[PDB]
From a paper:
Though anhydrobiotic tardigrades (micro‐animals also known as water bears) possess many genes of secretory abundant heat soluble (SAHS) proteins unique to Tardigrada, their functions are unknown. Secretory abundant heat soluble (SAHS) protein is one of them and is constantly expressed at high levels in [name]. A previous crystallographic study revealed that a SAHS protein (RvSAHS1) from one of the toughest tardigrades, [name], has a β‐barrel architecture similar to fatty acid binding proteins (FABPs) and two putative ligand binding sites (LBS1 and LBS2) where fatty acids can bind. However, some SAHS proteins such as RvSAHS4 have different sets of amino acid residues at LBS1 and LBS2, implying that they prefer other ligands and have different functions.
The RvSAHS4 structure was refined at 1.5 Å resolution. However, MolB in the RvSAHS4 structure had a 310 helix (η1) following αII and MolA also had a helix‐like structure in the same region [Fig. 1(C)]. Residues located at LBS2 in RvSAHS4 were also distinct from those in RvSAHS1. LBS2 in RvSAHS4 was constituted by Cys120, Val142, Tyr144, and Gln153, which respectively correspond to Tyr117, Asp139, Tyr141, and Lys150 in RvSAHS1 [Fig. 2(B)]. Hydrophobic compounds such as FAs, bile acids, and retinoid, which are ligands for FABP family proteins, could not fit well into the electron density. Therefore, we modeled short PEG molecules contained in the crystallization solution (triethylene glycol in MolA and tetraethylene glycol in MolB) [Fig. 2(C), S2, Supporting Information]. Our observation that LBS1 in RvSAHS4 is blocked by Tyr65 and that PEG molecules were found at LBS2 suggests that RvSAHS4 mainly uses LBS2 to capture ligands.
Author numbering: 27 to 171
The structure:
Amino acid sequence: SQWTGKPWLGKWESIDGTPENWEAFVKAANIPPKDQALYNGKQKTLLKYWKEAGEDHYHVQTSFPGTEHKMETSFKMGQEGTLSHDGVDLKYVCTEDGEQLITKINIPSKNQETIVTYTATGDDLEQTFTSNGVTGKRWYKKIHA
Ligand SMILES: [Zn+2]
Ligand SMILES: [Zn+2]
């Protein structure tokens, strides 16, 4: 059978600065100032994806060290999940295209969809996100912890 790589598995730290095309994305995707703040300034994002051997699901954890905006959940490929933040529901489905993780997101209350892709090779991860026709790109470095 096929050898498979999932290079997005691991822990990741956002590189210094704002995502590529951030200004345009903020405007088009109508990112509120409260959400903007988490990606502006010295604030880091930590992202962790993992799979334990004997389970049929993946785990994800995001944290913004210094703040209380954390997320921790599990998902199965192709199966819908729902998350909520400050009373706003987000529906998502994760899939794979070869080595790339794809997350399709819908926010019904805003009539807004986002697609996020995670493309990694070795110590580097590119997170591409598109919403309302505008694409931003954020880079992360692999970290041990
Ligand atoms: Zn588990
Ligand atoms: Zn929050």
